[PDB]
Structures are given as structure tokens and as C-alpha cells.
Design a protein around this ligand. Structure first.
Ligand SMILES: [Br-]
Ligand SMILES: [Br-]
Ligand SMILES: [Br-]
Ligand SMILES: [Br-]
Ligand SMILES: [Br-]
Ligand SMILES: [Br-]
Ligand SMILES: [Br-]
Ligand SMILES: [Br-]
Ligand SMILES: [Br-]
Ligand SMILES: [Br-]
Ligand SMILES: [Br-]
Ligand SMILES: [Br-]
Ligand SMILES: [Br-]
Ligand SMILES: [Br-]
Ligand SMILES: [Br-]
Ligand SMILES: [Br-]
Ligand SMILES: [Br-]
Ligand SMILES: [Br-]
Ligand SMILES: [Br-]
Ligand SMILES: [Br-]
Ligand SMILES: [Br-]
Ligand SMILES: [Br-]
Ligand SMILES: [Br-]
Ligand SMILES: [Br-]
Ligand SMILES: [Br-]
Ligand SMILES: [Br-]
Ligand SMILES: [Br-]
Ligand SMILES: [Br-]
Ligand SMILES: [Br-]
Ligand SMILES: [Br-]
Ligand SMILES: [Br-]
Ligand SMILES: [Br-]
Ligand SMILES: [Br-]
Ligand SMILES: [Br-]
Ligand SMILES: [Br-]
Ligand SMILES: [Br-]
Ligand SMILES: [Br-]
Ligand SMILES: [Br-]
Ligand SMILES: [Br-]
Ligand SMILES: [Br-]
Ligand SMILES: [Br-]
Ligand SMILES: [Br-]
Ligand SMILES: [Br-]
Ligand SMILES: [Br-]
Ligand SMILES: [Br-]
Ligand SMILES: [Br-]
Ligand SMILES: [Br-]
Ligand SMILES: [Br-]
Ligand SMILES: [Br-]
Ligand SMILES: [Br-]
Ligand SMILES: [Br-]
Ligand SMILES: [Br-]
Ligand SMILES: [Br-]
Ligand SMILES: [Br-]
Ligand SMILES: [Br-]
Ligand SMILES: [Br-]
Ligand SMILES: [Br-]
Ligand SMILES: [Br-]
Ligand SMILES: [Br-]
Ligand SMILES: [Br-]
Ligand SMILES: [Br-]
Ligand SMILES: [Br-]
Ligand SMILES: [Br-]
Ligand SMILES: [Br-]
Ligand SMILES: [Br-]
Ligand SMILES: [Br-]
Ligand SMILES: [Br-]
Ligand SMILES: [Br-]
Ligand SMILES: [Br-]
Ligand SMILES: [Br-]
Ligand SMILES: [Br-]
Ligand SMILES: [Br-]
Length: 580
């Protein structure tokens, strides 16, 4: 056999180390269920033996249902998975470097070396006016050194309900963007920051964010707010200066161009009250504020303690100015001041100060924060924060405290999400099973929250297409998308299987939410299905990375997502039958 091929799962990686087991696969048919306007993903895994194989290509037919209705091959995109190297540890420079097929790369032909695995990602977009039914088609694999091509039989059912547009839903997604990292990677010089030259490298990935449901847009308001935790520095989008009167002045230039970009793309809509500007942060690292002191002609820094007279003085200067600026733009009503996981004493000082500063219409800034909530029903303080995100590692699965806390917030019209980060399992790292992202999103609905937050849209290292390794965290933790090649003419980013599985989770919880709203005789039964979700236990590999606690826990992540999705599609069929 020069080239072997099988359908493979999108839930886990097919790795070079598993070559001998992968070569035993022989799956030749696939079927899944979608809504009108939904998407499906599949994968074909291939392998070479002792000869290289050249010009491997995959092609889809049109898909046709039992009434001759057509879903064009125009709607099918087949992209090779590209591997990149990852140190498999966390803060462990001596851990092994291994390849991972983390990049959904380009369409077209691939030459494959001897004794290798290579996989191709298949994406099927169901048009928003597709007719329901069972559709049949095929994908053909050809190569130069392959006498007999492979034909894989594909089918899917389109159910007679319409996948909601993200704007139609109540799902909250927030992924933090780092547009200065994009500028670094694509060689955008300082003077071209937030010009069209920079925007050409931002718009594609920001539309990707918008189209999957992204609503939150982060903007830094002080210098180096996270103490340079990432490969790239975090510049402030608002420049601070101290003048000869001893008081502060602010330059919003970058902030304004970044926010307006997101408005023009339709992520934010201040007039409609849609989306959030998350301003990071009133509690930056060690309270440190760097500013240019005009009187001495040098950069200086202070780190006033929250609630001190000096801290109140400085933050009242910033907040009242910023508020007036935002009101001039018409952006105030969607703007949140972000806090972070800090001492309760510091958080209380922030909330006290922000509630005190009001516009001429008696409104204060909205407030957003990560919080460490684990138990109890005292919601007095949390009710003063308009959007909170709880990390997975703080959530006790055995208890209803989280769900009760989030339900109280839903009733008050406040926002709640969960997040994952370094050390969590399930998570969204290069080394994760992609399936873990779908599980994550279902977990957000299990907890009766609005959705999901992650810090990590695009925090690229130097050359992530070749090596994602960073001095901190599990590999891939800081980015869900890849850049394109530095000299690309065309694409400006690549997606990842782990991102695509977040997107699948989001579409599928949106199905659940649609049915809970539209189908009253089914709502309680749907809630009870979601509330049956199991949670896998976590452990660690030998190099400090969070992983499943066992093979049983690993398989549970997959089988639970499957199970819930199938139950929801059965409720969908029930609702369709009722509606007739
Ligand atoms: Br073989
Ligand atoms: Br499979
Ligand atoms: Br499969
Ligand atoms: Br293995
Ligand atoms: Br396998
Ligand atoms: Br089969
Ligand atoms: Br399915
Ligand atoms: Br061989
Ligand atoms: Br195709
Ligand atoms: Br294609
Ligand atoms: Br694709
Ligand atoms: Br590689
Ligand atoms: Br690993
Ligand atoms: Br070392
Ligand atoms: Br080691
Ligand atoms: Br290896
Ligand atoms: Br392409
Ligand atoms: Br070779
Ligand atoms: Br969506
Ligand atoms: Br230009
Ligand atoms: Br563009
Ligand atoms: Br574009
Ligand atoms: Br989507
Ligand atoms: Br920090
Ligand atoms: Br730090
Ligand atoms: Br700058
Ligand atoms: Br600054
Ligand atoms: Br000013
Ligand atoms: Br300005
Ligand atoms: Br500017
Ligand atoms: Br502007
Ligand atoms: Br634009
Ligand atoms: Br635009
Ligand atoms: Br909103
Ligand atoms: Br701190
Ligand atoms: Br300091
Ligand atoms: Br500065
Ligand atoms: Br200086
Ligand atoms: Br100083
Ligand atoms: Br300084
Ligand atoms: Br300092
Ligand atoms: Br000062
Ligand atoms: Br100070
Ligand atoms: Br004081
Ligand atoms: Br003072
Ligand atoms: Br003031
Ligand atoms: Br004002
Ligand atoms: Br004013
Ligand atoms: Br406003
Ligand atoms: Br105060
Ligand atoms: Br708390
Ligand atoms: Br109590
Ligand atoms: Br309180
Ligand atoms: Br609290
Ligand atoms: Br924990
Ligand atoms: Br965890
Ligand atoms: Br919701
Ligand atoms: Br590094
Ligand atoms: Br770390
Ligand atoms: Br270049
Ligand atoms: Br693009
Ligand atoms: Br809806
Ligand atoms: Br009903
Ligand atoms: Br019924
Ligand atoms: Br039932
Ligand atoms: Br469980
Ligand atoms: Br290991
Ligand atoms: Br395992
Ligand atoms: Br395993
Ligand atoms: Br399964
Ligand atoms: Br299903
Ligand atoms: Br019904």
C-alpha cells in the first residue's frame, strides 16, 4: 500500500507516534446531523509506507437529498492539517518537543514523506435556505502513486429548524485580542499602528471571531497591564501623561481606532447596546501605572494601593475623563471597567470608587471581572459586578452552588461566563483533545451561565507555525488561531481543531437554548438532559501539563458531548413533529 486512508474523528489528534495503530483503520462511511444554516466537520487520516507519495488531493462531490435538492460542493472546504512542534510541558524547558496537527492549513495538494501520518480537515456549511432531508455525497482521495483512488461515502441529515445567527442568541463569548502582537508578527511599524496597513491583518480574524459569536472586546487602559506575561508586550491603548499642574492627561488615539474597527466590523454596536468594551484594568499588575512626566521629561511609575487617597485621586482623574470621552463618542453604555483576581479589599475599593463616579444621567461604569467564586449564596458583592467569569478549576461539580449563583444573575440580567486557562482540564491547548472545547461550552450551559471567556485569541510566540513553545503554560494556551505565513499574500490567519470544537459547542448550546425558548412542553426535559452531564477528573503529564486523570476520564469528555448533542437533536425532531 503506497497510501492508506480512513475516515477519522475530529475529537482527538492523529499523531505520528501512533502510526502503527492508525494504519489499522478502515472506516469508509460517515453520517451526522445538522440544522439548516449549521456546519459539520469531519476528517480523513492518511498514511504512507516505505515510499513518499506526491500530489495527494481530496475532492468533494455535490450533496443531494432524496428530492434532488442540492447543497453545492461550493459549501465544502477540505484543508490539510499542518503540524507544528510543541514542548509538551509547562514551564519545563527540558520537556520533549513533539509534533501536533493543530493548524487547519490550506486546500489543494500535499506531498507526504515516507512512513508518515497526514490528515485533512473537512468542513461542510449548510446554507441558511437549505431544504431538510438526508443528503448523500462523496469525497475522493487521489495521488500520483496511487493506482486506485479512495471514495468515502458521506451523508448528513438536515433537520427542519434554522441554526440561530449569533446575534439572535443570548450566548456570551469573549476572547482577548492582542492587536499589537498581530502588528509585530506582520512587521507593522509603530507609525502604521491602527492604520489600514494594520487593519488588513486584523479584519479576517476579527470577522472569524464575530461570526462564531464573539461579543467582548478587550482594550488596555494602562501600560503593560499584565507585567509582560506574554511573548509580546501589552502596550496601553490609552497613553498617560502628567503635566506641570501635576494632573493627568490622556491620549485615546489607539483605543479609538481599535474600538471603531470593531464597530465597523459589527462586533460592537453601542447604539444598539450590543457587545462589550472591556477595559483592562483598574487593578493592573501590582497596581502599577506608568506615565510620561512632562515636568521632568521622563517616564515615571506609581503603584498606589487601592482605596488610598492617592489611588482615589488618580483613578477619579482617569475615570471621569474617560467617561466624558466615551460619552462624546456614544460608546459609554457598552463600556466595562475590568478588575481581576485580586484581594477582596482591593476589589471592594474598586467597586466603591466606580459606583461613586456618575455621568449627568446618574449612570456609573459597568464592571467586569474574573472572580474566584466557589460556594455559598451571599451574592451581595457579586451583584455589583455586571459581568463575571469563573474559572473551571474553581467550580465544584458535586454542588449546585455555581448554578444557583448564575441563575440569580440571569434573573437580574447580569452576565456570567466560565473560563479555562493554564492548569485546567478540559481545556484548549495544542496538546488537548479538540473535543475538550465542545465539552467546555456544554459545561457553560450545565452551570446556567451565558457562555465562555478565554484570554487567548491570538497571543502568538515568534513563529508558531513551526514551534508554539513558550516559557509559561501548556503549549498553545495563549492563542486559538495561528497567523498565516509572514509573507502570505492572501490568508492572514489559520483556524485550529480546538477552536472549531469551541464553535461546534457554541452552535450546539445555541440549539439547546433555542428549543428551551421555543418549545415549552420540552424545556424541563431539555434542562434535565443538560443537567445529567458528567465531568472528567484531571491529572498531569510528567512535564507539568494538565491532562485527563485516566483513559476513562478522557473518553468521557467525548462521549458526554456526543450524548448531549444527540439528545438535543432528538428533542429537535420532537419539536419539528409537533410543529408539523
Ligand atoms: Br497499510
Ligand atoms: Br471515527
Ligand atoms: Br467519526
Ligand atoms: Br500513544
Ligand atoms: Br486510532
Ligand atoms: Br465502513
Ligand atoms: Br450527530
Ligand atoms: Br511500511
Ligand atoms: Br472540495
Ligand atoms: Br476544497
Ligand atoms: Br476549512
Ligand atoms: Br512539525
Ligand atoms: Br502530552
Ligand atoms: Br534544559
Ligand atoms: Br524533565
Ligand atoms: Br514523536
Ligand atoms: Br487554499
Ligand atoms: Br521521503
Ligand atoms: Br454561533
Ligand atoms: Br495599506
Ligand atoms: Br481586508
Ligand atoms: Br476580510
Ligand atoms: Br459557528
Ligand atoms: Br498579572
Ligand atoms: Br507577573
Ligand atoms: Br505603542
Ligand atoms: Br502609557
Ligand atoms: Br485629557
Ligand atoms: Br485623543
Ligand atoms: Br493613531
Ligand atoms: Br477613530
Ligand atoms: Br473597516
Ligand atoms: Br470593516
Ligand atoms: Br450583548
Ligand atoms: Br497583583
Ligand atoms: Br512596581
Ligand atoms: Br508611558
Ligand atoms: Br524615559
Ligand atoms: Br519612577
Ligand atoms: Br518607569
Ligand atoms: Br512602581
Ligand atoms: Br502621582
Ligand atoms: Br505610590
Ligand atoms: Br490614604
Ligand atoms: Br492625594
Ligand atoms: Br477629575
Ligand atoms: Br460625563
Ligand atoms: Br463633561
Ligand atoms: Br453613551
Ligand atoms: Br471611594
Ligand atoms: Br467571590
Ligand atoms: Br446560608
Ligand atoms: Br458588598
Ligand atoms: Br463575593
Ligand atoms: Br481545582
Ligand atoms: Br480544571
Ligand atoms: Br443563556
Ligand atoms: Br520564550
Ligand atoms: Br507557568
Ligand atoms: Br516576510
Ligand atoms: Br483571511
Ligand atoms: Br434564539
Ligand atoms: Br412545546
Ligand atoms: Br409535547
Ligand atoms: Br422526555
Ligand atoms: Br460526574
Ligand atoms: Br508524559
Ligand atoms: Br489518558
Ligand atoms: Br489514553
Ligand atoms: Br462517543
Ligand atoms: Br446527533
Ligand atoms: Br413539542
Amino acid at each position: 500500500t503506497t497510501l492508506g486512508a480512513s475516515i477519522g474523528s475530529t475529537d482527538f489528534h492523529y499523531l505520528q507516534k501512533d502510526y502503527d495503530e492508525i494504519k489499522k483503520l478502515n472506516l469508509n462511511t460517515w453520517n451526522e446531523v445538522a440544522w439548516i444554516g449549521d456546519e459539520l466537520n469531519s476528517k480523513i487520516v492518511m498514511w504512507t509506507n516505505s515510499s513518499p507519495v506526491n500530489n495527494v488531493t481530496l475532492s468533494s462531490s455535490d450533496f443531494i437529498n432524496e428530492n434532488g435538492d442540492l447543497i453545492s460542493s461550493n459549501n465544502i472546504k477540505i484543508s490539510w492539517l499542518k503540524e507544528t512542534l510543541a514542548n509538551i510541558g509547562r514551564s519545563n524547558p527540558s520537556a520533549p518537543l513533539e509534533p501536533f496537527p493543530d493548524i487547519i492549513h490550506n486546500s489543494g495538494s500535499l506531498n507526504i514523506e515516507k512512513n508518515k501520518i497526514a490528515s485533512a480537515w473537512i468542513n461542510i456549511k449548510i446554507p441558511r435556505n437549505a431544504k431538510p432531508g438526508i443528503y448523500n455525497g462523496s469525497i475522493e482521495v487521489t495521488a500520483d502513486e496511487l493506482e486506485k483512488s479512495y471514495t468515502f461515502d458521506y451523508s448528513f441529515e438536515v433537520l427542519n429548524l434554522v441554526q440561530p445567527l449569533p446575534s439572535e442568541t443570548n450566548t456570551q463569548i469573549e476572547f482577548w485580542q492582542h492587536p499589537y502582537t498581530i502588528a509585530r508578527y506582520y512587521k507593522i511599524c509603530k507609525e502604521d499602528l491602527f492604520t489600514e496597513k494594520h487593519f488588513k491583518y486584523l479584519r479576517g480574524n476579527l470577522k472569524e471571531y464575530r461570526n462564531m459569536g464573539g461579543r467582548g472586546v478587550i482594550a488596555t487602559i494602562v501600560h503593560e497591564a499584565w507585567n509582560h506575561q506574554s511573548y509580546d508586550s501589552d502596550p496601553s491603548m490609552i497613553k498617560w501623561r502628567k503635566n506641570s499642574y501635576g494632573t493627568f492627561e490622556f491620549d485615546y488615539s489607539h483605543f479609538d481606532k481599535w474600538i471603531q474597527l470593531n464597530i465597523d466590523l459589527g462586533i460592537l454596536d453601542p447604539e444598539k447596546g450590543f457587545g462589550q468594551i472591556k477595559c483592562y484594568s483598574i487593578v493592573p499588575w501590582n497596581n502599577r501605572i506608568q506615565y510620561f512626566n512632562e515636568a521632568t521629561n521622563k517616564e515615571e511609575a506609581i503603584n498606589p494601593t487601592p482605596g488610598s487617597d492617592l489611588w482615589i485621586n488618580i483613578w477619579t482623574q482617569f475615570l471621569t475623563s474617560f467617561m466624558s470621552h466615551l460619552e462624546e463618542k456614544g460608546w459609554f453604555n457598552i463600556t466595562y471597567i475590568s478588575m481581576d483576581e485580586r484581594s477582596m479589599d482591593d476589589l471592594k475599593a474598586c467597586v466603591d470608587l466606580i459606583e461613586n463616579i456618575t455621568n449627568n444621567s446618574y449612570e456609573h461604569f459597568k464592571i467586569s471581572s474574573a472572580m474566584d467564586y466557589e460556594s455559598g449564596n451571599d451574592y451581595s458583592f457579586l451583584d455589583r459586578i455586571d459581568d463575571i467569569s469563573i474559572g473551571l478549576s474553581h467550580i465544584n461539580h458535586n454542588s449546585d452552588d455555581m448554578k444557583n449563583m448564575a441563575t440569580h444573575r440571569q434573573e437580574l440580567g447580569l452576565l456570567t461566563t466560565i473560563y479555562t486557562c493554564t492548569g485546567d482540564y478540559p481545556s484548549s491547548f495544542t496538546i488537548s483533545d479538540p473535543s475538550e472545547g465542545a465539552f467546555t461550552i456544554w459545561y457553560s450551559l450545565y452551570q446556567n451561565t451565558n457562555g465562555f471567556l478565554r484570554w487567548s485569541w491570538d497571543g502568538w510566540v515568534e513563529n508558531p507555525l513551526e514551534n508554539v513553545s513558550y516559557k509559561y503554560w501548556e503549549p498553545g494556551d495563549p492563542f486559538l488561531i495561528y497567523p498565516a505565513e509572514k509573507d502570505s499574500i492572501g490568508k492572514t490567519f489559520y483556524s485550529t481543531p480546538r477552536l472549531e470544537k469551541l464553535k461546534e459547542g457554541i452552535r450546539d448550546i445555541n440549539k439547546a437554548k433555542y428549543l428551551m425558548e421555543k418549545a415549552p412542553n420540552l424545556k424541563n426535559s431539555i434542562e434535565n438532559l443538560i443537567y445529567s452531564l458528567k465531568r472528567p477528573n484531571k491529572g498531569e503529564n510528567a512535564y507539568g501539563s494538565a491532562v485527563a486523570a485516566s483513559k476513562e476520564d478522557r473518553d468521557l469528555t467525548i462521549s458526554e458531548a456526543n450524548r448531549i448533542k444527540n439528545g438535543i437533536n432528538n428533542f429537535a425532531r420532537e419539536f419539528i413533529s409537533l410543529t408539523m
